[PDB]
Amino acid sequence: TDADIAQVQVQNKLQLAMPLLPQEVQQQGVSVEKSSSSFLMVVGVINTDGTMTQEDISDYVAANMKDAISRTSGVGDVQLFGSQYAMRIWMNPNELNKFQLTPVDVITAIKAQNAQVAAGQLGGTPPVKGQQLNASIIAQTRLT
Amino acid sequence: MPNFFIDRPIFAWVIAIIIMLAGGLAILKLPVAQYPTIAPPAVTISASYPGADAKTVQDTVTQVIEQNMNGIDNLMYMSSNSDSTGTVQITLTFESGTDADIAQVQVQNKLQLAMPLLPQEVQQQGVSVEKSSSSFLMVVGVINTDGTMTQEDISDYVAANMKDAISRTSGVGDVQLFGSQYAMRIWMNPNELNKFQLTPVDVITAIKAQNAQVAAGQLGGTPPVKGQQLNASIIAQTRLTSTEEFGKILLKVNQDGSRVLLRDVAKIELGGENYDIIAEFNGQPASGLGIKLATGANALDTAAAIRAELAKMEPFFPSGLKIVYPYDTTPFVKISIHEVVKTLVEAIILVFLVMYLFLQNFRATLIPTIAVPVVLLGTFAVLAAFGFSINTLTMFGMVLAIGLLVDDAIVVVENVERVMAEEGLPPKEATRKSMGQIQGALVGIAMVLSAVFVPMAFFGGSTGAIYRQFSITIVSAMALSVLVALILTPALCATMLKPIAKGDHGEGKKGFFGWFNRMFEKSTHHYTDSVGGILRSTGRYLVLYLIIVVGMAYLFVRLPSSFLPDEDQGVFMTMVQLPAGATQERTQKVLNEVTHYYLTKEKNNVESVFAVNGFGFAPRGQNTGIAFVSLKDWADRPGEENKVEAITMRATRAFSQIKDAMVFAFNLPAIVELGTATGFDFELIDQAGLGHEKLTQARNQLLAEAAKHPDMLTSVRPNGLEDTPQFKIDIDQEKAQALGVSINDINTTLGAAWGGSYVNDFIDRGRVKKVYVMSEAKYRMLPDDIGDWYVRAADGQMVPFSAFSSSRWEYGSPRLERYNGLPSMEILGQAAPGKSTGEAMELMEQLASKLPTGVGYDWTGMSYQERLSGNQAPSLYAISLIVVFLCLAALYESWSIPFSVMLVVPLGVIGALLAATFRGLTNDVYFQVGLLTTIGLSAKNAILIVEFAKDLMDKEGKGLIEATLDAVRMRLRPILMTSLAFILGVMPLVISTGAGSGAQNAVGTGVMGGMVTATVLAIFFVPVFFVVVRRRF
Amino acid sequence: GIKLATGANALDTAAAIRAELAKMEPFFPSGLKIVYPYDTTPFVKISI
Amino acid sequence: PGADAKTVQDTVTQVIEQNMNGIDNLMYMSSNSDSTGTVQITLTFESG
Amino acid sequence: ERLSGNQAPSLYAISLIVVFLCLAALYESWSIPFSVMLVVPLGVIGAL
Amino acid sequence: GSDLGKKLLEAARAGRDDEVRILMANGADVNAADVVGWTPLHLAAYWGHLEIVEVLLKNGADVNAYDTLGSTPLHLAAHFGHLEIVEVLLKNGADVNAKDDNGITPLHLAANRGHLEIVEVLLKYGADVNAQDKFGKTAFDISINNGNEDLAEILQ
């Protein structure tokens, strides 16, 4: 069986199911892969000077190394032995209740104040007659 | 095998007939295009984020898609651009030989599962995955001459009435609209919105409610009450269809009872989906269709079919609408076929005249006139079997092989005529003996030429695919030439030729031929006397050979290297680049001046100017433009003064006077994907999250160092754009919450007004089209206009933007580049005059190694091709030489004698180099393939001389010099006949100054010069080589 | 943890992985080092 | 769902069919736009 | 059905020519093949 | 403007000391402004080109030149953490309490990015610590909101 056509046929059917799946599952990213069940190799990464922790090395591999290896021809699947960094907001229920707030309010505020806004241009097309200024309008950007 | 077919001429005829029918069928059915598929397979991912800046596009779209392009097969590299027009283009380039359909579907499938991660605005617009292709068959311009239509009106008409019908035309692959179908444009007024306490949020909400398709159900649907008589579908709310309906969209009902409609707060019209591009054709508004040829289709049939469809659309056009053809390749391809068919016909006529001049019987002149067409036809059947097309490269590949085809015909027939004249044998017995002398050599030649040309097919990348076109074409024609020479030609000779009495060399005739035969027989004695003198003093000719070899090596190094010669194709582009922040109106004034020039000062040359404002070479924006010039017929432009090169240099010089703009004209390349010979393509990479500003500093550091080496590097610049001043506005979160104003309402109001918002779809005359809400131009021009926009608070009060916002000027990128998922900056440049591409690249690497920590680099495009193409050459040259030697060793049964043949190579190369150098031409592929065919024919001439000489020594027991003199005597006439015919055959190609002359000159010049020296020197030097080699070993 | 794509060559893919890792090594933060704790390909090369 | 044949044809069928250019060995194309809200565009290709 | 009927004449023409040429090559003759190929109508009428 | 005015704006931004030198000798307009109202001194201050800032001030560049949104070169230098340029501009008579259209001062911008050395230099040249922006916010109100406890102590 041509593995290319097998993958193509499987995904054509998966795409009919995708809309019916929960929004949380879609946002985690569904993956269709054609690979062996066993490992070809394990590429281990360490810090000999002991300057970087297990989490620091895991983030570096994920952020700088993994993507290029995943795109390499013949690499069917790549498994990170660790986790990429995320902005972790560890909520306190005692402090949330104190100010009469919930996780719903925390999530709403992050979506609102961690936003990348498309705000158009000064002197954008179609413009008026005799326009001299053309500049991108920069509003809210992602927090860093 | 020749003996077999001498006794069986009908069988020989049956094979020739079958070959001609297969070839005759091939000619009818073979695809036709200008060039074949050369570039490696590339897939482009295009997305639009309306009103988004470069960083917004990159950090929400580009990076998300890039991170998800995993588990795809045969990916070489990935590159992307994110610009301030709200556009992202990610290009994935694949290994040469990859199935482009499988490449696309794999990319497309990985994007599909990454779509839920993209912004809802980008998901709504869509993300196109297409196979990257630059080559258009033709560009159909659609204009309005009576000034009753805008470019938006014409674009909508073409989309609705023309595009689909052109897409269904026979041989048409893809069709690109130069514009968009209408969009329902709601131009909002902030003064009117604030007056009724409304915002863009309310306008979008109302349109979504009052322009929608609502599912109802059925009367008497299943399961029903038994006895039900009727079952009908219930139709509820359907989409709005007109500007009138959109204007009557209810927004608000006032306290008194008066109604606020959408037409009260906004101007409503059918307009363009976007207004970035302004297209003009000789000043008049214009749209158009960019048409590509389908796979395995005929360019000439497709172009005829396209014009046939447009012809029967003519009667239904609105008043003023006119079709124009600013770009069409088929008139150029029509000439290319005619000129190649002409060359082949003239070559057959020239052979006929030469054959009659020497042999002086019409029966002899027929055998080549039959054999050569049979080989040519057979070649087409083999191209079709390989899945090749009738294209510029394959056509000139057969022109370059004419010399080899013609020689096979002459060599077989001439040798029979001699044997009959020298011995008085009857045609059939003479043919048997004649073939007996050459049949072993002809097979040896077939293997030697295979050893030369076949390895040329095994180069990788773009240049390898080009060389593969010439390789298979020449090898196929050569292979069939030898089969026809071993099967048909001997059978024709034995049956058609007239017997010659022994000793009859035609010296006893009267008139021209009596004189000629006596002149030539006397000249043959002068030649053998001269060789006798040369072979008494070989030492001085060995010295002269080393002068030629040194002179060759010197001229090779001096000759500038190119890919394909630039042609006058009746069109050329003019670039218009204004400084940073320059508006669309300023760019139009420069374009209007550029157009006015071409229609005034080049009115006898220029037919039309296609001025496109908002689109450059690589970049987009209001400060970029391009003027595609279309010239009159070649016949109306006589002399070099009225050609693209002369006009280009004239226009560029005239436009250097233009202020606050960088303008210049230039000719189109033969094939865009190759770039320039000596030109390199460098990528500077952020390898440790340094950021944009630090990669810019590192780029400036590299560019400055490159400027200190003008001896090696020339015009080393960035391919991208510089940082521009951008209007940063900060929303005060505390003030918004204090006033009871939601951030969604603020960012929607700003985004929808200033950037534009794609709300939903409506149906215009039975066609689904987009609905856009945006600010009427005058209220979104300047920073002071920010305060004119009001957002409604929770308590109902209208709050101006100034109350909860603060702004400042800062610098940011209007175009962010990435390479293999990392931030990058593309640097273009070329090797300085006299320097190789390799040397220039080595310095850039040396300069790159001295840049700040975390700044890497990589080679892309032609530079990626050049490296992997250069690493193979030594191996492919070695294999060729080794197999040539081994083949000659088997033929001559000698490890030493093969050297006497292989020493001929420089004799043909020096003549090609002198001709190319003198005429001021380059070391292009046509010249390079020309060298191999020149080397090939001279090698064949030497093989038959050495074979005759060796056989005389072995069979008749003659001495070394006696055999050598008797050999070159017998071989003089056939060598001169081929040379005389072939040199005259390529004379029209050399002197050609018409359309496609650039390629003709490149093919002709190098071949003529090479043949002249190859012929003159070899007849004197091959005798020396054989004697010297035989004496030594 | 790398897994071989269906019908792909183990040695060619392993060589292509090492070639890509070689491009990353020079821009490593101080101390960071690649180790090879598990590889099935050395056996195939050596055994042949 | 809920759209009549005409609505289905204008919003779906013609949007898909106008993009079915530049496909190899395509003999003919047939489609049905129905009251059920359903589209079925069948592309028949050359033998082989 | 249309395709089948349209291509049948050319199939007969090429078929007759291939048999003729095959006989001409085998028997080293133009007379034997032509003498043989004249028989075809005697068969075809019986089939009709 | 003029032809040389454009080249000085480009050279000042790019950090080309040699080109600025030749342009000052040839008499390139130091008061040349782009469409947003940025002088060569604005650009030199923004990108942190110390020598060009000094050369421009020697050749009579307006130290208190403001853009179309009322921001000065000291605003730019203070915001992007260019300590040496802030000192040079203040020695050549840059308004330490210069307010943009938003009521923002060089102290506000320095406090926002946590440029402690620059904040101290501004206070040394008499930066109004009680100066409020359009939202009634001081440099101290920014430090407590940003959570910069080192900066908050300096501003008392």
Ligand SMILES: CCCCCCCCCCCCCCCCCCCC(=O)O[C@H](COC(=O)CCCCCCCCCCCCCC)COP(=O)(O)OCCN
């Ligand atoms: C839709 C389908 C598309 C296809 C298009 C149609 C193409 C059709 C082509 C196929 C038919 C082949 C043509 C046959 C021609 C034969 C000529 C016969 C001559 C003749 O009668 O004289 C013979 C003797 O002459 C001799 O001995 C003759 C010797 C020299 C050969 C004659 C020249 C042949 C030229 C070939 C035709 C080229 C056409 C190019 C396509 C007598 O016969 P005999 O048996 O008594 O002779 C003794 C044998 N020992």
Ligand SMILES: CCCCCCCCCCCCO[C@@H]1O[C@H](CO)[C@@H](O[C@H]2O[C@H](CO)[C@@H](O)[C@H](O)[C@H]2O)[C@H](O)[C@H]1O
């Ligand atoms: C031993 C006896 C054998 C019998 C044949 C004798 C051959 C010589 C005489 C033939 C009679 C005709 O004579 C012939 O006239 C023609 C026409 O002017 C000449 O014409 C030819 O030669 C002249 C030079 O002389 C060339 O410039 C010209 O291109 C060529 O056509 C011949 O040179 C001449 O030989």
Ligand SMILES: CCCCCCCCCCCCO[C@@H]1O[C@H](CO)[C@@H](O[C@H]2O[C@H](CO)[C@@H](O)[C@H](O)[C@H]2O)[C@H](O)[C@H]1O
């Ligand atoms: C760079 C461009 C020029 C390169 C061209 C080279 C090949 C074409 C020129 C052919 C010249 C051959 O011409 C031939 O030269 C040799 C020289 O060895 C002469 O030979 C002469 O010298 C030799 C050696 O001492 C004597 O043995 C001989 O008796 C005497 O005639 C021939 O009489 C002459 O017919």
Ligand SMILES: CN(C)c1ccc(O)c2c1C[C@H]1C[C@H]3[C@H](N(C)C)C(O)=C(C(N)=O)C(=O)[C@@]3(O)C(O)=C1C2=O
């Ligand atoms: C560059 N290109 C070949 C031309 C030439 C002349 C033109 O007159 C035009 C183009 C590009 C096309 C692209 C189209 C694109 N699309 C196919 C609708 C498009 O989405 C955009 C866009 N910026 O998103 C256009 O500008 C565009 O509407 C446009 O205005 C064009 C246009 O008017």
Ligand SMILES: CCCCCCCCCC(=O)OC[C@H](CO)OC(=O)CCCCCCCCC
């Ligand atoms: C009789 C022996 C002939 C040996 C030469 C064979 C060369 C074939 C090399 C090859 O396969 O590639 C062809 C190449 C494609 O880029 O085209 C070429 O570059 C043309 C080669 C011209 C010069 C040949 C060397 C003679 C110098 C002394």
Ligand SMILES: CCCCCCCCCCCCCCCCCC
């Ligand atoms: C009978 C003549 C035909 C022979 C031609 C076949 C040659 C095939 C070319 C093989 C390519 C080898 C490339 C090696 C590159 C390794 C780089 C060190």
Ligand SMILES: CCCCCCCCCCCCCCC
């Ligand atoms: C590709 C070139 C290979 C050349 C191989 C060398 C051949 C040496 C010739 C020796 C001849 C032996 C003479 C008889 C003793």
Ligand SMILES: CCCCCCCCCCCCCCC
């Ligand atoms: C690349 C490997 C093959 C090279 C060609 C081999 C040539 C063999 C020459 C042998 C000469 C033997 C001389 C006998 C005295």
Ligand SMILES: CCCCCCCCCC[N+](C)(C)[O-]
């Ligand atoms: C395999 C390399 C090509 C060598 C061809 C030489 C063929 C010589 C045949 C000589 N012959 C037997 C006909 O006399």
Ligand SMILES: CCCCCCCCCC
């Ligand atoms: C119209 C298509 C058939 C003719 C094409 C020309 C082929 C000539 C190639 C030498």
Ligand SMILES: CCCCCCCCCC
């Ligand atoms: C010394 C010069 C002699 C030239 C002899 C060459 C004659 C060749 C004519 C075909």
Ligand SMILES: CCCCCCCCCC
């Ligand atoms: C290509 C045609 C071959 C059919 C005839 C068989 C030839 C045998 C003659 C001895």
Ligand SMILES: CCCCCC
């Ligand atoms: C010796 C027979 C050769 C003919 C086959 C094509």
Ligand SMILES: CCCCCC
């Ligand atoms: C060009 C495709 C068909 C070839 C016939 C063998």
Ligand SMILES: CCCCCC
């Ligand atoms: C001996 C007859 C040769 C057959 C060629 C097909």
Ligand SMILES: [Cl-]
């Ligand atoms: Cl950054």
